[PDB]
Design a protein around this ligand. Structure first.
Ligand SMILES: [Mg+2]
Ligand SMILES: [Mg+2]
Ligand SMILES: [Mg+2]
Ligand SMILES: [Mg+2]
Ligand SMILES: [Mg+2]
Ligand SMILES: [Mg+2]
Ligand SMILES: [Mg+2]
Ligand SMILES: [Mg+2]
Ligand SMILES: [Mg+2]
Ligand SMILES: [Mg+2]
Ligand SMILES: [Mg+2]
Ligand SMILES: [Mg+2]
Ligand SMILES: [Mg+2]
Ligand SMILES: [Zn+2]
Lengths: 217, 152, 130, 108, 148, 291, 275, 166
RNA sequence: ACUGAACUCCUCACACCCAAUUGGACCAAUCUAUCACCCUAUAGAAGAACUAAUGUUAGUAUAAGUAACAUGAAAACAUUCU
């Protein structure tokens, strides 16, 4: 409706012509989704490209730093340290994590890790990304944490700070290779369908039905 | 002061109000329903009832003929009257119309009412239905009425 | 909230209520017609300076009258439907110069009154009076 | 004529806040059973009334496009017909008009 | 002004007069400047008189900040927590001495209108006046015009 | 003591409901579909044993919270404060309906229970009461009854007009107090444990358990007082606008046990009465109910 | 715009004052607020209250257990004042009793011990000690310091003064402060009683005298909304006390109170306390 | 200009303990630059203050004024806001704490009078503020009765004392 | 015989009640010079201080939500009618 209203109002405009380009730090979406089970050479070539662009790179040490980044990002959510949270999280992962939590605090502690975090696959981006490239890694994580969300007025919406609950996820990190200053940062989540639903909320809820414009149906 | 005056001053004169109600008549008699301000409709009701009672006589009466000729400016609803409405109310003697207040007009917040001849074709109105007989109090009423009928 | 009786019932029961209330009123009036069968208060003859209770009437209209002299006199009609007595007081209770009685006017709907007034009229036995 | 001293805030406030200048809450509202909206008891349901008015509007459109011009008012009764309906023996001679919709249960 | 200003009845803290008297000045805090023509009086006062004042009054405690201040202050905290600060800006030594001494002699409560210049917590002896003190009784306590 | 017995009954009913809603799981969820001409299509997420149709109407609008008396669960009445245990279809009922007979029966039951409670709390602490039950009667009966048996010393005595007025003002005070109907579903053995004393309530609970295949019974409490009721009941006493006792009658098998039956009449707020029709309804309810 | 910034400075001061009045921050300890020297404060407090004794005992009385607990807790992440408080409260009760039954031999053990318990009550001691400026001196974990904790610290100070200076000096101290605090609050204001008529009956039956009768001596406004009765309690045709009252019951119970005061010697017209 | 009313909702209280009073959720909402007058918008406001959301909506729906529809849509917006993004369980369990009107940035025009004289027309705009709170509405305080009159009078007579002496 | 003042006494301290006019001791805020630096000092200078001019400009009140203003009727909003 933007273009139609523009033409009908008379706000005709030329295309923005300028040598400058809008530079970003994280590609939108994902390149390859590891559809989990009910419970390769491509990744090898990906790791080869990773090493080529960045010789100083190890795999087996990656899960440790991944778990560390996860728990520290949650601690930064608790403390509201948005600057370092940005430095450690991508622009695609910041909104969905920090949009709804406004007008409310949060509590998240890391008890332990039942299973050690484990790399699943690795993908590398083609050169046709604004003349840049980005590398992605996927890691399964199985741990036990607590979650407690107080609203504006300090009353719990759900969750309990004392009782942890086993939890499994597939996290994805990504990094900018073209620049050297880019570091691995959380990008998205897969939320597979077969996984069960999380704990509901203590409060009851309704929905508004179809509003029958003054004509029965 | 006014004591016993049944009419009400309505427009810029007697001619104004009669022509006004005559236009309301010509509008009402064909649509067999009409919205309008409450006072206008209250006055319109009596004129409509008297007009149908005056037209019951039929078309042969030159009196009714010329009277309806005056009261109706479209000149096509007079046959409709004589050959539809009088047959419709041949059995009826009173209560030919129904008049009911409705929400106020948009801009002037005026008090408005809808009126329509009984036994129309188009859909009915959401009339105020009296309380149901199955209610507690109505059933108590039926109970002691039966008891009185049993007594006598 | 404020409501009225006519709304919370059915049209097949409304005429029942109407005729039943009318019959009750007529029965009360027929019963209180004769005060002699009921116990009356002591009667005394007229004395000098004494007074007599008044009453209430209903004005119907006017009409002419003619005298033996052929003279005309306009004259109003005053009609009396029920005109029952309602209450008596002692000149001590009243603390006035003279004792007082109460008289009613016209019988009207028992529905459009106050609860205390209806209680008074019931414990008295007669219908309401406006 | 003209004033002589400015009315103070206290007296202006008393005057313009006295109860008759205020609005009186009205305890004359209840819920409409079938539509599910509010209504004044002596007034009709605005929602149902607008529904009926729109229906009558389209019926008037239909009869007008049938008559095809002014001064075409017949001298007989008329009846509506909805989808899935047949003319009756009663309305055999009565005029009929067609409509493209389903019969509402509230309409006969 | 009395109606604009608050008021109080005359009273002392913890009944200071009955037992051992205690000067209810607790603490002093001086804010004076090394430089500043305004603080020269305070500097003279602290260099000569404050020694003897502290010697005479041990119960009081004195704090001196000696920081840059365009206007030198003196703050006095008393037993009740009553803080009162006053400017010694451009004041002579003798008036500073009188000021600190009146502070020492003051009590721990604001200066306001005193409703009464006295206070007796048990004013009545021989019994407080009631209407029946100065009138006799009746034989068998009979009200006027009473048979039995 | 009777007072101590009432407090013990209260404590045991509290323990029972506590066990119930502690046994029921936590953070449970159900989806109830609203039905009716008004606001159809809506579906409400509710708790399995803490939510109620009152909370439903509170989600919806205050009008239904104040105007509703019962609810139909899959075509079955319900207590507005009794929690719904499963996803189902739900409708609200009111006095202003086409078939309010069920709400009417519920009101009959509630008024009978109220009169029973007040008459059992009124009498001499040294006298005894062995109430039996609140019988069911049709709407045209003209009065809600309540059967009872009493001490033998006062068998000849009947309640006077001042006693009737005292009972009526007691009931008015109760309805001003505005206590809700604490409802619960308890076991047959539990009901027997609670009402073990009065053989009448014992054998009535036994009859109810024999009528019910699983023998599960329903209890209803008014603050301190409890009694069994066949059908659901009203949410808040305060809905009853006027309420009084008409007369008392005493039934021929009096020798083995006296059979007194009190009788009263009342009407709610949503449709109040006028003084006159109300007085004649009273002089009707003064009639002896043969049933 | 107007030049100059002296007025802007003055107005900033007024703005911050208004802001403090609107949303004032919570209070804090004078120990951590500036211009504080602990040892000098203790010494000057001693000189103020006119006593001279050991600073170590002073500090051990001022310190509490909660402060030590918090200190060692944060140190991970010395001597309490309990015995001194116990000694002080014990000697205080003993000496207060001594003085009180010396001044009023007629007062019974029950009433005198209730009175002493009141005078040692947390409210009066805490008020006196705040007026004495110990609250900030006391080391505590929670602020404002609890009244029971402050009472323990006060009685520990008392015990220290005893163990250092002497019992007679402790006696002068407690006498002055506590009885001066009591001067105003009268007997039935400090100590509560039920059925005072029954208490009086028991008392004078112990004293072996006739059981008195209550008789309205004077009356006014009996039918009036503000009844006033003067009731006298007469034994063997002799009056002990009269009492005014709204009603006859209030008048007779007040007369009982008056007679009890007269018998126990706590009349308002009694000999003042000798210092 | 001042717009603190919108920031009033930006506050976030700290977490509450289990054993403490459940805090009642407040909420603020306003409409800006309504073409209406203060002296009558305030009448509508004082009407709807001290009552519940549903009968407020009803009274405004059936009251025949222009500002009624404005306040109505404002209240509906406040309700749906509070339920969607303020953790309100029941949309109908709300009540008005205070609703007020305030002057706005107005405009001036010229009204022509006779004989060359002119007059200034100021078209008037009103900001409308409203505060909602969860829970049932508090009851209106009943009138103090004869017992209260007598009690306050007698405690006055007891509190009084002699003056200007010991 | 008493009551009865800013008179007089009484405890303390005192320059602290007249129009026009005249003589004197201080001082607010500002710029400059030199100090000082949570707002001050000593000197000079001056566009140097407003409860009032049917005072000027801008805003907002009272009068006042008052005086005053406006859209012919019905309806498919196509048309018709007065
Ligand atoms: Mg006109
Ligand atoms: Mg004098
Ligand atoms: Mg003099
Ligand atoms: Mg002098
Ligand atoms: Mg002069
Ligand atoms: Mg200066
Ligand atoms: Mg200068
Ligand atoms: Mg100038
Ligand atoms: Mg000025
Ligand atoms: Mg001027
Ligand atoms: Mg107007
Ligand atoms: Mg005027
Ligand atoms: Mg006008
Ligand atoms: Zn409807």
């Amino acid at each position: 409706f933007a273009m139609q209203h523009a033409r009908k109002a008379g706000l005709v405009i030329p295309p923005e012509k300028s040598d400058r380009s809008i530079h970003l730090a994280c590609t939108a979406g994902i390149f390859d989704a590891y559809v989990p089970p009910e419970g390769t050479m491509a990744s090898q070539v990906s790791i080869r490209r990773i090493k080529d662009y960045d010789a100083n790179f190890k795999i087996k040490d990656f899960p440790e730093k991944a778990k560390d980044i996860f728990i520290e990002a949650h601690l930064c959510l608790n403390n509201s340290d948005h600057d370092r949270l940005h430095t450690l999280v991508t622009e695609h992962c910041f909104p969905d994590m920090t949009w709804d939590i406004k007008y409310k605090t949060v509590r998240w502690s890391f008890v332990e890790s039942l299973e050690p975090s484990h790399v699943v696959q690795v993908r590398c981006s083609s050169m046709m990304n604004q003349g840049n490239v980005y590398g992605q890694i996927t890691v399964r994580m199985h741990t036990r944490q607590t979650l407690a969300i107080y609203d504006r007025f300090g009353r719990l919406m759900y969750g309990q700070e004392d009782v942890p609950k086993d939890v499994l996820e597939y996290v994805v990190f990504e990094k900018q290779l073209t620049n050297p200053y880019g570091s691995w940062r959380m990008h998205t989540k897969i939320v597979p369908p077969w996984a069960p639903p999380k704990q509901p909320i203590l409060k009851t809820v309704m929905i508004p039905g179809p509003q029958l414009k003054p004509e029965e149906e | 002061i006014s004591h016993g005056r049944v009419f009400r001053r309505m427009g810029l004169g007697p001619e104004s109000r009669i022509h006004l109600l005559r236009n309301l008549l010509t509008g009402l008699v064909r649509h067999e329903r009409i919205e309008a301000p409450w006072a206008r409709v209250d006055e319109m009701r009596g004129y409509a009832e008297k007009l149908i009672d005056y037209g019951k006589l039929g078309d042969t009466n030159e009196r009714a003929m010329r009277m309806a000729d005056f009261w109706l400016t479209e000149k096509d609803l007079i046959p409709k009257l004589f050959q539809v409405l009088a047959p419709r109310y041949k059995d009826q003697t009173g209560g030919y119309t129904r008049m009911l207040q409705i929400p106020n007009r948009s801009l002037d917040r005026a008090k408005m009412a809808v009126i329509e001849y009984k036994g129309n074709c188009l859909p009915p109105l959401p009339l105020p239905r009296r309380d149901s007989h199955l209610t507690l109090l109505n059933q108590l009423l039926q109970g002691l009425r039966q008891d009185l009928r049993q007594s006598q | 909230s404020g409501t009225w009786w006519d709304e919370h019932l059915s049209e097949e029961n409304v005429p029942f209520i109407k005729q039943l209330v009318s019959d009750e009123d007529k029965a009360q009036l027929a019963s209180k017609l004769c005060p002699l069968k009921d116990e009356p208060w002591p009667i005394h003859p007229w004395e000098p300076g004494s007074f007599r209770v008044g009453l209430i009437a209903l004005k119907l209209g006017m009409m002419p009258l003619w005298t033996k002299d052929g003279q005309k006199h306009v004259v109003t009609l005053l009609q009396v439907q029920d005109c029952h007595v309602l209450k008596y007081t002692s000149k001590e209770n009243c603390n006035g110069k003279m004792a007082t009685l109460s008289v009613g006017g016209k019988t009207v709907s028992r529905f459009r009154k106050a609860t205390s007034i209806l209680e008074f009229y019931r414990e008295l036995g007669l219908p309401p009076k406006q | 004529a003209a004033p002589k001293n400015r009315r103070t805030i206290e007296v202006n406030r008393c005057r313009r806040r006295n109860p008759q200048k205020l609005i009186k809450v009205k305890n004359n509202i209840d819920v409409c059973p079938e539509c599910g909206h509010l209504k004044q008891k002596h007034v009709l349901c605005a929602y149902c009334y607008e529904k009926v008015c729109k229906e009558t509007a389209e019926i008037r459109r239909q009869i007008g496009k049938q008559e095809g011009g002014p001064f075409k008012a017949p001298t007989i009764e008329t009846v509506v017909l909805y989808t899935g309906e047949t003319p009756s023996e009663q309305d055999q001679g009565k005029r009929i008009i067609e409509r493209d919709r389903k019969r509402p249960s509230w309409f006969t | 002004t009395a109606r604009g200003t608050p008021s109080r009845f005359l009273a002392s803290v913890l009944h200071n007069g009955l037992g051992r008297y205690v000067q209810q000045l607790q603490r002093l805090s001086f804010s004076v400047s090394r430089d500043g023509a305004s603080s020269r009086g305070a500097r003279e006062f602290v260099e000569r008189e404050v020694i003897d004042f502290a010697r005479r009054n041990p119960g009081v405690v004195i704090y001196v900040n000696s920081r840059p201040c365009c206007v030198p202050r003196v703050v006095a905290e008393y037993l009740n927590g009553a803080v009162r600060e006053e400017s010694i800006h451009c004041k002579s030594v003798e008036e500073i001495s009188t000021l600190v001494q009146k502070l020492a002699d003051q009590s721990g409560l604001d200066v306001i209108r005193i409703r009464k210049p006295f206070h007796t917590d048990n004013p009545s002896i021989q019994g407080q006046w009631h209407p029946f003190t100065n009138k006799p009784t009746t034989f068998r306590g009979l009200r006027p015009r009473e048979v039995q | 003591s009777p007072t101590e017995l009432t407090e013990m009954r209260n404590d045991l009913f509290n323990k029972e409901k506590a066990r119930q809603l502690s046994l029921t799981p936590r953070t449970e969820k159900i989806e109830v579909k609203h039905v009716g001409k008004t606001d159809p299509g809506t579906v409400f997420v509710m708790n399995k044993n803490i939510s109620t149709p009152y909370s439903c109407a509170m989600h919806l609008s205050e009008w239904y919270c104040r105007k509703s008396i019962l609810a139909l669960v899959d075509g079955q009445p319900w207590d507005m404060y009794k929690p719904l245990t499963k996803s189902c279809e739900i409708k609200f009922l009111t006095f202003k309906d086409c078939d309010p007979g069920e709400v009417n029966k519920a009101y009959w039951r509630s008024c009978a229970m109220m009169m029973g409670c007040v008459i059992e709390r009124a009498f001499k602490d040294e006298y005894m009461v062995n109430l039996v039950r609140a019988p069911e009667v049709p709407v045209i009966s003209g009065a809600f009854c309540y059967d009872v048996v009493l001490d033998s010393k006062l068998d000849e005595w009947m309640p006077t007009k001042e006693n009737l007025r005292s009972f009526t003002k007691d009931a008015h005070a109760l309805i001003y107090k505005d206590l809700p109907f604490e409802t619960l579903e308890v076991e047959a053995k539990v009901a027997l444990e609670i009402f073990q004393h009065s053989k009448y309530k014992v054998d009535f609970i036994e009859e109810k358990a024999s009528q019910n295949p699983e023998r599960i019974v329903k209890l209803h409490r008014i603050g301190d007082f409890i009694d069994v009721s066949e059908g659901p009941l009203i949410p808040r006493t305060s809905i009853c606008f006027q309420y009084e006792v008409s007369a008392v009658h005493n039934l021929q098998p009096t020798q083995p046990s006296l059979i007194r039956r009190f009788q009263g009449v009342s009407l709610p707020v949503h449709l109040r009465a006028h003084f006159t029709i109300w007085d004649k309804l009273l002089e009707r309810s003064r009639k002896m109910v043969t049933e | 715009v107007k030049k100059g910034f002296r007025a802007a400075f003055r107005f900033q001061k007024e703005l911050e004052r208004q802001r403090l009045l609107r949303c004032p921050p919570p209070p804090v300890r004078r120990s951590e607020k500036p211009n504080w020297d602990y040892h000098a404060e203790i010494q000057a407090f001693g000189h103020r209250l006119q006593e001279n004794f050991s600073l170590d005992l002073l500090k051990t009385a001022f310190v509490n257990s909660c402060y030590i607990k918090s200190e060692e807790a944060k140190r991970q992440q010395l001597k309490s004042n309990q015995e001194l408080s116990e000694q002080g409260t014990s000697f205080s009760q003993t000496c207060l009793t001594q003085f009180l039954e010396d001044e009023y031999p007629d007062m019974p053990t029950e009433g005198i011990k209730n009175l002493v318990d009141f005078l040692t009550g947390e409210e009066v001691v805490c008020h006196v000690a705040r007026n004495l400026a110990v609250e900030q001196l006391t080391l505590s974990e929670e602020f404002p310091v609890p009244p029971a904790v402050l009472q323990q610290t006060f009685f520990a100070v008392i015990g220290a003064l005893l163990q250092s200076s002497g019992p007679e000096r402790t006696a002068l101290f407690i006498r002055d402060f506590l009885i001066t605090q009591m001067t105003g609050k009268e007997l039935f204001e400090m100590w509560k009683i039920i059925n005072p008529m029954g208490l009086l009956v028991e008392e004078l039956k112990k004293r072996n005298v006739s059981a008195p009768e209550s008789r309205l001596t004077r009356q006014s406004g009996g039918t009036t909304a503000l009844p006033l009765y003067f009731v006298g309690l007469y034994c063997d045709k002799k009056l002990i006390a009269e009492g005014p009252g709204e009603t006859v019951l209030v008048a007779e119970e007040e007369a009982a109170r008056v007679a009890l005061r007269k018998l126990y010697g706590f009349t308002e017209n009694r000999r003042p306390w000798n210092y | 200009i001042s717009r603190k009313w919108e920031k009033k909702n930006k506050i976030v209280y700290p977490p509450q303990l289990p054993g403490e009073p459940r805090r009642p959720a407040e909420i603020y909402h306003c409409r800006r630059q309504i073409k209406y007058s203060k002296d009558k918008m305030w009448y509508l406001a004082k009407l709807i203050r001290g009552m519940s959301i549903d009968q407020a909506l009803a009274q405004l729906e059936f009251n025949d004024k222009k500002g009624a529809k404005i306040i109505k849509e404002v209240l509906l917006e406040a309700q749906d806001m509070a339920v969607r993004d303020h953790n309100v369980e029941f949309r109908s369990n709300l009540y008005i704490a205070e609703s007020t009107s305030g002057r706005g940035q107005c405009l001036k025009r010229i009204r022509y009078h006779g004989r060359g004289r002119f007059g200034i027309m100021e078209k008037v705009y009103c900001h409308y503020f409203v505060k909602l709170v969860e829970g049932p509405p508090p009851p209106p305080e009943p009138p103090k009765t004869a017992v209260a009159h007598a009690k306050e009078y007698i405690q006055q007579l007891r509190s009084r004392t002699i003056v200007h002496t010991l």
